Amino acid sequence: GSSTMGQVGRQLAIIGDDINRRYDSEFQTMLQHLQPTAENAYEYFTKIATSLFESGINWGRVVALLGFGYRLALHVYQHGLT
């Protein structure tokens, strides 16, 4: 409800909607360029994570990798459905 917990929850909804609208299109472009398959998806994800964390680590970088891994797995799943 209108409690302080309900206030924070609705503020995270706006942050998450802003994260989704700012980077989902970029995730799809990066996945289209990588052309990942079920054979090299985990190999790609490990190489990307090491290149990512080579310049440091913060919670923003971790949630970006989590969101990209989810789009990665979703991309390999849907492009194999025949």
Ligand X SMILES: CCCCCCCC(=O)OC[C@H](COP(=O)(O)OC[C@H](N)C(=O)O)OC(=O)CCCCCCC
Binding site for ligand X (CB under 6 A): 29, 38-43, 45, 57-59, 62-63, 66-67, 69-70, 72-73
Binding partner at 42 among its own copies, ligand X, none, C-beta below 5 to 8 Å by kind: ligand X
In this chain, which residue has its C-beta nearest to ligand X?
69
Binding partner at 28 among ligand X, its own copies, none, C-beta below 5 to 8 Å by kind: none
Q: Give yes or no for a contact between 49 and 9, defined as CB atoms under 8 angstroms apart.
A: no
CA distances, 24 to each of 5, 20, 72 (Å): 28, 6, 11
Residues engaged in binding its own copies (CB under 8 A): 3-13, 15-24, 26, 30, 33-34, 44, 47-52, 54-56, 58-68, 70-71
Q: What is d(CA 40, CA 61) in angstroms, rounded to the nearest whole number?
A: 22
Rg (alpha carbons) of the chain, rounded to whole number: 16
Binding partner at 82 among its own copies, ligand X, none, C-beta below 5 to 8 Å by kind: none
Q: Give yes or no for a contact between 61 and 53, defined as CB atoms under 8 angstroms apart.
A: yes
